[PDB]
């Protein structure tokens, strides 16, 4: 059903009788009560036009966020592709279990102190099983088939679009089981989407340190089976392990229950 | 509405005082459709044989218990024709109907939260407890860093000794792939945590049992391995 | 070619390179609250 | 073709060329339990952490309910704003509301008795718009008489000088408060002999149908 | 009614009679006199085509103006969002009481001496209640949900559009009362629209001072209940307090009334 | 797609991508007293500060009116240009006109007697196009005979060599002057015994219907 | 989607990101001057 | 004509003005054994 706006409130009056009772409910059945405000108090007729577009999953998720930072103090680094490295986004996408979406990436590159220097960089996306470069002049940099991006540092940040590349129907943030017939537990093969590598094009030694920031935007998202959020700080990038001593309470405590 | 009876297969469960039936996410279990199937081998549907209600062990509720949980379908992996069949195949798809029974006298008090959490992942062997089922250690965070106070967002039914003694949940097969193994993955887990501790005056039936009964609904299988 | 995860502006051949427009406004009340 | 540059170019904003020119995604399959609107999660009832006492930090299991004994005084009281830190923090509704700045709509609070079957009594639940001192001065505001099926469903009507209210705090934002919820003994908790003299009551909170939110923020 | 042009002047002649008198009026009633020029002197027929588009509120207000200046001589500053910091615009928007409009912002960034140096900056808009960053490397900079803008100094000035974000129907420049049940007086909660924070992206220490200038443009404005202007210099940024000794006269004085 | 850059790019002019992609503003409500055109404020009558004497700086309350006593001489005189500094500065019409450079249209000046009821007399109000010395030489220009309901409405017709006139000052802009307004005693201010011998007259100024402005400027 | 404070050129999905065109030319004489 | 720059400009991606304005390629001829889909080789 379509609900462009929240339901209006109808007029009501006092009620006195036997048998009918909307106030009493049955929470043991596990169903939220369907009692409306018009069934307990006298309410005037109020028409509301509060739209619900801002609460759609697409608008809620359509916000770029930092996913990882890369520093280049040999001239190249091969960074594995993962999106669970920062809480600010991990908590957001971990509320659901399975989501199918479309990712858009943006790369911001600058020196450690933020100064900009003319320098040419190259980015390659290595699918799983593809050869992995091991040197600034490795033969794997010929990018015969793998996609490549070339951009100068002074140029505006690059923007690319990545389709949904999982073998399964949708990504899964949890895998209760083993992929093979203890650290292995919880590793879903359907999430390893290859790695990422950056380098300086010149065969010489670059004289400036390189820092890259990657922001991921989402679109055409579709969620399934929402799960409760997380109220404990993360400890690892793969499993929900937590500090077993300082169990943080969900709600801040007070002095007395009567006040 | 207080009474109900379920007669799936060669078994039957009756209750003279029970709440309503809770269907998970409003999707009745059903066989895999042709438009969604990816397997090319003809599957097998044992039907009546695998839908017999299976009763697991009995857990003893105490005045200071923490909670218990089970992993599915690892509980049924080692019992009955379902066990002897899943050990001979490679592809598995079925729903589940979960029934939990725990009855006390009219003078006892206490509450239970029977909730099925799909795709339960633990944190810091015990991952697959089996038919016995393991106990919890930190029920407030469910050993997974999530608050129990928000566990009601999942399909659940309350068992309050004041009103009812049993609860039922009918959960369909939920997984990102139409078929999936039975020895390397767990579709979902079940949580039973006493929110309100059991209290009673001295001189009552101290032994109070807890029993869980489950039964597959629309079982199907594919592939013929040797023995796993 | 049609290839997307799921009134939008597209400038390329592929269908997964586009900007989402006015998102759909549709919810199913009973399904989550009252699944009995 | 003539063109003119405009201010704001090369400005990256957090709110695109494709890389694979022939990818066809894996076909979707029917998965039960799909969410199309984030407001649906808010319309579900979750447990409320009323007993957030200082001594309950080490044993959080007792922070999900408050006791009822044999005494007309009060038993518990808390603010009803879902945004401010406190009991509402444990609810998924409050947790989601932390991600937004402005919200509007009525709220519903449902209680559930967990005592013995032979136990009986009457309790009064009252909501006070912008703390009461006793029963007769608390009865003026909106209230519901509750008697021990046992599930009372208190509804918090939406009364505010503004269409959209913001999360409350100390300072100027105090003007955006919503009110105080309190419960009182209508009659004493009567229990027969050979039965427990103490009972626990859990609190469940949810949102009504006319709820809405806007101005998404990051917490 | 629509009045694209000012009213034309009709022809007239001499009048001599009793009873009718347009010259006499009644200012005690508080209504401006409705006497037209044709009712007192003989006037030729003059047709005018002077348009009144330039006097519309939209054209009168559609002019960007400086609202604040920010200097960065720790590498970040959290500046509270307020528009009453400069008289040139405060007098303009303070003529009305309630206005609903749509704001457009433009940021100009340069060194104190006006020189331009390649450097990358980041701007975040923090809504009220959102976490406030406290360091150049604070975790709040992950901008999971808050909007962000990234731009190099040498790039053209950034332009963004901000919608009308007040909980009430329109902004109010005056609040005669208290928001809570002495310095507190006059503080309307419906005006605090969060704060503003800027920083240098690099985790190092930036070697150049940063000065930012913010100009605000307005559009789709709608005013209500105009109020008299202000003839005294401002003394504070919150209340209309003034110097109580040197009361500046509205009109410049002269020597003698007869000359 | 081919394109060519043009002069004037990257040029920020004081005369845009959105940041929130799903914001729905708070619904408007009916508020009395809405202004759609700034010219409406100009068509309202406001007080004129005729008595801007040097000694009146410390006591501005007496700068809003001028006295009338028992004497045919003159009582007050001032320039009629709303832009130049002087009496017109206190009027909202002049204050608004400070924000514009060119204006055109006729003006209206309304007076109000504030003396005793038994007081009576006749006063002459005259407007002189581009200062008179006496009554007979001031009567040549446009004038209105006023007798003591007591509200005379002098109208200043629009006579100028140019369609749009600019604010006057010293220098070349003197050519844009408009004229001199003066008032004279037609008859002596007659009062009976046992009554005050001095009366005060306030001056109210406004703009006619055919007023217009252009070339907005910042003062 | 329609979302604005109140013949205009818009290049984005939101309605509050646009440039105001020829402003409306309409006034109510009597309302302020002669409200008796 | 007004225009606004967008992120991702001047970004060379591995996935065009002509140089010869009047070239007509040599006419094609019928060659046996043409492959239209790479999947055909896999079916051997």
Q: In a mutagenesis test of the F interface, which of G32, G34, G35, G36 is the best target, namely the one with the most F β-carbons within 10 Å? A: G32
> CB–CB of B112/B192 below 8 Å?
yes
Give the C-alpha separation, C20 to C16, whole Å. 10
Instruction: Tell me the C-alpha distance between F106 and F159, whole Å.
Output: 8
Cα distances (angstroms) measured from residue E217 to each of E67, E90, E159, F70, G19: 10, 14, 10, 58, 11
- The rounded distance, in Å, linking the Cα atoms of E129 and E61 is 31
Strand B209-216 to strand B54-60: parallel, antiparallel, or no bridges (unpaired)?
Answer: antiparallel
Nearest-angstrom CA–CA distance, A231 and A251: 10
Our measurement of the distance from residue B135's CA atom to the centroid of its chain's CA atoms, rounded to an integer in Å, reads: 15
Which among D6, D12, D21 has CB closest to H3?
A: D6
Q: Tell me how crowded residue A101 is: count the other CB atoms within 10 A of its CB.
A: 20
- Residues sharing a CB contact under 8 Å with residue E236, sequence separation 6 or more, in sequence order: none
- Quick one: E119 exposed, middle or buried, by C-beta within 10 A (0-12, 13-18, 19+)? buried
Distance from H38 to chain F by nearest Cα, in Å?
Answer: 32
Q: What is the CATH number of the domain that holds F38?
A: 2.60.120.20
* F interface residues, H as partner, C-beta within 8 Å: 3, 6, 17
Q: Which residues of E touch D158 (CB under 8 A)?
A: none
| Cβ within 8 Å of C, B 11-50 | 20-26
| Number of domains chain B is built from | 1
- The token duo for D201 is 């009551």
Nearest to F94, CA basis, from F142, F153, F41: F41
The contacts of residue A183 (CB under 8 Å, 6+ apart) are none
F neighbour chains, 3+ CB pairs within 8 Å? A, D, E, G, H
Query: Six-digit token pair at C3?
Result: 């290839």
Classify residue G30 by its DSSP letter: H
Minimum-distance CB partner of A222 among C6, C28, C33? C6
Q: What is the DSSP string of B167-218?
A: EEEEE----SSS-B-SSSB--EEEEEEEEEEEE--SSS----EEEEEEEESS
- What 8-state DSSP symbol labels residue E4? S
> Which of A70, A64, A198, A74 is CA-nearest to residue A126?
A198
β-pairing verdict for F122-128 and H2-3? unpaired
**Looking at beta carbons, which residues of chain B come within 8 Å of C31?**
25-26
* Distance (Å, whole) CA D105 – CA D83: 13
Rounded to the nearest angstrom, the gap between the alpha carbon of residue F140 and the centroid of all alpha carbons in its chain is 23
Chain A residue with the nearest C-alpha to that of F21? A59
Neighbouring chains to H with at least 3 Cβ pairs closer than 8 Å: A, D, F
List beta partners, residue D53: A254
Q: Which tokens sit at B173?
A: 């097969």
Q: Measured between beta carbons, which residues in chain F are less than 8 angstroms from residue H3?
A: 3
- Closest-CA distance of chain H to residue A107, Å: 9
**What span, in angstroms and rounded, lies between the C-alpha atoms of H7 and B45?**
56
Pairing of strands A98-110, A158-162: antiparallel
Residues of chain E contacting residue A66, judged by C-beta atoms under 8 Å apart: 141-144
Distances, alpha carbon F55 to alpha carbons E93, E116, E254, F60, F62, in Å: 34, 55, 10, 9, 10
The span from the CA of E41 to the CA of B194, in Å, is 97
Task: Indicate left, alpha or beta for A80 from its phi (over 0: left) and psi (-120 to 50: alpha).
Answer: beta
Spell out the CATH class of E1-259.
mainly beta
Phi/psi for B64 (5° steps) reads: -135, 30
Rounded to a whole number, what is the distance in Å from the CA of F17 to chain G's nearest CA? 6
Residues in contact with D100: Cβ distance below 8 Å, sequence separation at least 6, in sequence order: D213, D214, D215, D216, D217
Distance CA F107, CA E35 (A): 11
Can you tell me the distance from the alpha carbon of E39 to that of E18, in angstroms, rounded to the nearest whole number?
Answer: 14
Among C5, C23, C29, beta carbon nearest to A56:
C23
Please report the DSSP string for F167-184 in residue order.
---SSGGGGG---EEEEE
The owner of tokens 């725990």 is B102
What's the per-residue H, E or C state across B211-225? EEEEEECCCEEECCC
* Residue A240 CB burial class (10 angstroms; 0-12, 13-18, ≥19): buried
Instruction: Return d(Cα B147, Cα A230) in angstroms, integer.
Output: 7
CB contact under 8 A, H11 and D4: no
CB contact (8 A) between residue E144 and residue A92: yes
E strand or H helix at F166: strand F165-166
Put simply, the answer to whether C29 touches D43 (Cβ < 8 Å) is yes
Tell me, yes or no, if D32 comes closer than 8 A to chain C by beta carbon.
Answer: no
Cβ of A50 and F23 within 8 Å? no
CB B140 within 8 A of CB A247: yes
Q: Minimal Cα–Cα distance from A236 to chain H, Å?
A: 33
| Per-domain boundaries in chain A | 1-259
Q: Which residues contact E178 (CB under 8 A, 6 or more apart)?
A: E184, E185
> How close is the nearest chain C Cα to the Cα of B156, in Å?
10
Neighbours of B88 (CB within 10 A): 14
Element holding C17 (H helix, E strand): none
Contact between chain A and chain C (3 or more Cβ pairs less than 8 Å apart): yes
Sequence-distant (≥ 6) Cβ neighbours of residue E235 within 8 angstroms: E241, E242, E243
Does the CB of A244 have a partner CB in chain D at under 8 Å? no
Q: Which residues sit directly before a break in chain F (C to N > 2.5 Å)?
A: 15, 71, 130, 148
Would you call D16 and C17 a contact, using CB atoms and an 8 Å cutoff?
yes
Chains H and A touch, contact meaning at least 3 pairs of CB atoms under 8 angstroms apart: yes
**Which positions in chain G touch E56 (Cβ < 8 Å)?**
23-25
Under 8 Å between Cβ of F50 and F203: yes
Rounded CA separation F130/F177 (Å)? 7
Residues D107, D111, D114: CA angle, nearest 5 degrees: 165
Q: Number of Cβ pairs closer than 8 Å across D and H?
A: 32
Interatomic CA distance for residues E162 and E237, integer angstroms = 23
Is residue G31 helix, strand or coil? helix
Distance from CA of A63 to the nearest CA of H (A): 15
The H-or-E segment that residue F96 falls in is helix F92-97
Distance, CA of B63 to CA of B110 (rounded, Å)? 10
Two structure tokens written together for E177: 């009362």
Q: What is the DSSP string of H1-44?
A: -EE---TTTT-EE-----S-SS--PPPP---S---S-THHHHT-
- Asked if A198 and A76 touch (Cβ cutoff 8 Å), the reply is yes
In angstroms, the CA B146 to CA B140 distance is 8
Chain E: which residues have CB within 8 Å of chain G?
Answer: 1-4, 29-32, 34, 51-53, 56-59, 62, 100-102, 161, 163-164, 219-222
Chain E contacts of F143, Cβ < 8 Å? none
Distance from D149 to chain C by nearest Cα, in Å?
17
Q: What phi and psi values does residue H35 have, to the nearest 5 degrees? A: -110, 125
DSSP state of B145: T
Is the Cβ of C26 closer than 8 Å to some Cβ of chain D?
Answer: yes
Q: Does the G1-36 domain belong in CATH 4.10.80.370?
A: yes
Q: In a mutagenesis test of the D interface, which of C11, C19, C32 is the best target, namely the one with the most D β-carbons within 10 Å?
A: C32
Distance, in Å, from the CA atom of D98 to the CA atom of D42, rounded to the nearest integer, reads: 12
**Is G2 part of the contact surface with chain E (CB cutoff 8 Å)?**
no
Q: Which residues contact E114 (CB under 8 A, 6 or more apart)?
A: none
Q: CA torsion, points A148, A154, A157, A162, in degrees to nearest 10?
A: 0
Instruction: Give the domain extent around D106.
Output: 1-219
DSSP state of F87: G
Mutate to test the interface with A, among H14, H15, H38 (most CBs of A within 10 A): H14
Task: Count CB pairs under 8 A between chains A and E.
Answer: 69
Query: What is the SS3 string spanning chain D?
Result: CEEEECCCCCCEECCCEECCCCCCCCCCCCCCCCCCECHHHHCCCEECCCCCEHHHCCCHHHHHEEEECCCCCEEEEEECCCCCCCHHHHCHHHHHHCCEEEEECCEEEEEEECCCCCCECEEEEEEECCCCCCHHHHCCCEEEEEECCCCEEEEECCCCCCCCEECCCCCHHHHHCCCEEEEEECCCCECCCCCCCCEEEEEEEEECCCCEEEEECCC
Beta strands H2-3; D2-5: pairing state = parallel
Residues of E in contact with F101 (CB under 8 A): none
Q: Which two tokens stand for residue E44?
A: 């030729």
Q: Does C33 touch chain B (CB under 8 A)?
A: no
By the 8 A CB rule, do D150 and D113 touch? Answer: yes
Chain-chain contact of E145 with A108 (C-beta, under 8 angstroms) = no
């Amino acid at each position: 059903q379509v609900l462009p706006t929240a339901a209006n409130t109808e007029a009501s009056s006092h009620r006195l009788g036997t048998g009918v009772v909307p106030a009493l409910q049955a929470a043991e059945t596990g169903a939220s009560s369907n009692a409306s405000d018009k069934n307990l108090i006298e309410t005037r007729c109020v028409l509301n036009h509060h739209s619900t577009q801002e609460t759609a999953i697409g608008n809620f998720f359509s916000r770029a966020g930092l996913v990882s930072i890369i520093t280049m103090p040999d001239g190249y680094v091969n960074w594995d592709i993962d999106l669970m490295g920062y809480a600010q986004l991990r908590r957001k996408c971990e509320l659901f279990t399975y989501m199918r979406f479309d990712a858009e990436f943006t790369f911001v590159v600058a020196k450690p102190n933020g100064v900009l220097v003319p320098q040419l960089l190259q980015y390659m996306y290595v699918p799983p099983g593809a050869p992995k470069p091991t040197s600034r002049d490795s033969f794997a940099w010929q990018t015969a088939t793998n996609p490549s991006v070339f951009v100068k540092m002074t140029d505006p940040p690059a923007q690319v679009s990545v389709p949904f590349m999982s073998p399964a129907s949708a990504y899964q943030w949890f895998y209760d089981g083993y992929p093979t017939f203890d650290l292995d537990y919880g590793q879903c093969p359907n999430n390893m989407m290859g790695t990422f590598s950056i380098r300086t094009v010149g065969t010489e030694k670059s004289p400036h340190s390189i820092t890259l920031r990657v922001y991921m935007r989402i679109k055409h998202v579709r969620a399934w089976i929402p799960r409760p959020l997380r109220n404990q700080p993360y400890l690892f990038k793969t499993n929900p392990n937590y500090k077993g001593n300082d169990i943080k309470c969900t709600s801040t405590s007070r002095d007395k229950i009567t006040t | 509405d207080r009474v109900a009876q379920l007669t799936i297969g060669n078994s039957t469960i009756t209750t003279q005082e029970a709440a309503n039936i809770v269907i998970a996410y409003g999707e009745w279990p059903e066989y895999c459709p042709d438009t969604d199937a990816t397997a090319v081998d003809k599957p097998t549907r044992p039907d009546v044989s695998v839908n017999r209600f299976f009763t697991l062990d009995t857990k003893s509720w105490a005045k200071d218990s923490k909670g218990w949980y089970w992993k599915f379908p690892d509980v049924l992996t080692e019992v009955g024709v379902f066990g002897q069949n899943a050990q001979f195949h490679y592809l598995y798809r079925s729903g589940f109907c979960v029934h939990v029974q725990c009855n006390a006298s009219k003078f006892h008090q206490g509450a239970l939260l029977v909730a099925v959490l799909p795709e339960y992942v633990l944190g810091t062997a015990t991952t697959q407890p089996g038919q016995v089922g393991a106990v919890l250690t930190h029920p407030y965070v469910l050993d997974a860093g999530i608050p129990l106070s928000q566990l009601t967002v999942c399909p659940h039914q309350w068992i309050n000794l004041r009103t009812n003694n049993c609860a039922t949940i009918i959960v369909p097969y939920m997984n990102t792939v139409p078929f999936d193994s039975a020895l390397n993955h767990c579709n979902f887990g079940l949580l039973v945590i006493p929110v309100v501790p059991l209290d009673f005056n001295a001189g009552a039936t101290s032994e109070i049992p807890i029993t869980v009964t489950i039964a597959p609904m629309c079982a199907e299988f594919a592939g013929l391995r040797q023995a796993v | 070619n049609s290839n997307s995860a799921s009134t939008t502006i597209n400038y390329y051949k592929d269908a997964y390179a586009a900007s989402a427009g006015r998102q759909d406004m549709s919810q199913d009340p009973k399904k989550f609250t009252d699944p009995v | 073709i003539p063109t003119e540059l405009k201010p704001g170019t090369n400005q990256f904003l957090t709110t695109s060329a494709p890389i694979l020119p022939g990818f066809h995604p894996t076909p979707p399959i029917h998965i039960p339990g799909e969410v199309h609107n984030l407001l649906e999660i808010c319309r579900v009832e979750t447990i409320l952490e009323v007993n957030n006492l200082k001594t309950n930090e080490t044993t959080p299991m007792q922070r999900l309910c408050f006791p009822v004994s044999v005494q007309g005084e009060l038993c518990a009281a808390f603010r009803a704003d879902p945004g401010r830190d406190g009991p509402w923090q444990s609810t998924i509704l409050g947790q989601l509301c932390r991600y937004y700045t402005q919200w509007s709509g009525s709220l519903e609070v449902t209680f559930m008795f967990a005592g013995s079957f032979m136990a009986t009594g009457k309790m009064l639940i009252a909501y006070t718009p912008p703390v009461p001192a006793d029963r007769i001065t608390a009865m003026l505001g909106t209230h519901v008489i509750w008697d021990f099926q046992s599930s009372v469903t208190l509804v918090v009507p939406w009364i505010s000088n503004t269409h959209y209210r913001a999360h409350a705090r100390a300072g100027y934002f105090d003007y955006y408060t919503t009110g105080i919820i309190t419960i009182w003994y209508q009659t004493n908790y009567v229990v027969p002999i050979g039965a427990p003299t103490t009972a626990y009551i859990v609190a469940l909170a949810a949102a009504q149908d006319n709820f809405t939110m806007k101005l998404c923020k990051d917490t």
